[PDB]
Design a protein around this ligand. Structure first.
Ligand SMILES: *NCC[C@H](N)C(=O)O
Ligand SMILES: [Zn+2]
Length: 326
């Protein structure tokens, strides 16, 4: 029995604004709670979509779209059910950080979680055992965060069940981000991705920009894809917006480049720009001194720069850049 209990019904017709109340006894509140905001919109019979933003706290395109959806959608617009959680790892979202300030918990590495663990593990357990079985479709928004920046794209995994792999790709096509990706997310343990997919459910995941900020273009991409995906699922009516998309893959480790030293980061080729094998991706300047040649990082695969280290300061082990193919 997970101690979380909603403040609103999850199975009644109408529009509900309430919270997932997670008890949390702590120094600044002895009988306190984490009040995870959520909106349930239900109307008649139909599929149920579980919509999450801010799985990592410092990623904002999702929470912006889900807040708008929770505030501008009437029950009559829906055939089915929307479960809307704009801030998924809510303590991290309130702290403005990828991980939670309470337990340093990475929510996207905490599944299946446990009902008696950390605050983050209790969140993961509740979606693992209570919310996901209620859902047919799961849209889990992601962006680069303060340390990464991505080309705006929706992704689907090469997974072993080809039936629900096909369903995931169909929803990615419906999302219609400017780029479309099959992510090399090996290192697959503990993710919400893996929880949804292993249940045979439909998963939509994204990487919409980054840097700890969202733009009007990037907010719009999140709003379009969300609307398309809900129409594609049968929950919302209307005409889908179909624009051009570029298909990209990550077949290899050599799509990735990590830095081996700290310094001042100079990106030499912008996001989304084409790159050939061996082209100079970035150079890192010394923090300590002047007049020394920069440390050069070169592409090991041709394609497009789909991700880059965001901050001006880079550390050893940070991912300099990622190349997407075609
Ligand atoms: N490969 C999955 C995306 C990653 N966990 C992130 O940067 O959010
Ligand atoms: Zn993320």
């Amino acid at each position: 029995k997970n101690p979380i209990s909603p403040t609103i019904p999850l199975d009644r017709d109408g529009v509900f604004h309430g919270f997932l109340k997670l008890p949390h006894s702590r120094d600044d509140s002895a009988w306190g709670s984490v009040m995870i905001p959520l909106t349930v919109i239900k109307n008649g019979a139909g599929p149920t979509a579980l919509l999450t933003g801010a799985n990592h706290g410092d990623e904002y395109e999702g929470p912006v779209a889900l807040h708008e959806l929770a505030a501008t959608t009437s029950a009559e617009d829906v055939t089915g059910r929307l479960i809307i959680v704009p801030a998924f790892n809510y303590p991290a979202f309130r702290a403005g950080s990828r991980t939670s300030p309470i337990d340093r918990g990475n929510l996207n590495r905490s599944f299946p979680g446990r009902p008696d663990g950390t605050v983050t593990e209790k969140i993961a357990d509740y979606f693992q055992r209570t919310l996901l079985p209620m859902a047919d479709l799961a849209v889990d928004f992601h962006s680069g965060g303060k340390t990464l920046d991505f080309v705006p794209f929706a992704a689907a995994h090469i997974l072993e069940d080809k039936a629900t792999q096909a369903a995931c790709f169909a929803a990615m096509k419906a999302f219609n981000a400017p780029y479309s990706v099959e992510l090399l997310e090996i290192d697959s343990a503990g993710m919400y991705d893996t929880a949804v997919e292993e249940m045979g459910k439909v998963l939509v995941t994204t990487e919409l920009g980054g840097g700890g900020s969202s733009s009007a273009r990037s907010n719009a991409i999140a709003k379009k894809g969300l609307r398309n995906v809900l129409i594609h699922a049968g929950i919302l009516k209307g005409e889908m917006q179909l624009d051009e998309t570029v298909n990209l893959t990550m077949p290899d480790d050599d799509c990735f480049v990590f830095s081996e030293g700290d310094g001042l980061f100079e990106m030499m080729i912008d996001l989304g720009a084409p790159v050939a094998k061996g082209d100079l991706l970035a150079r890192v300047w010394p923090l300590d001194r002047t007049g020394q040649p920069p440390v050069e990082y070169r592409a090991r695969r041709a394609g497009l720069v789909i991700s880059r280290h965001f901050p001006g300061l880079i550390k050893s082990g940070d991912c300099v850049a990622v190349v997407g193919v075609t």
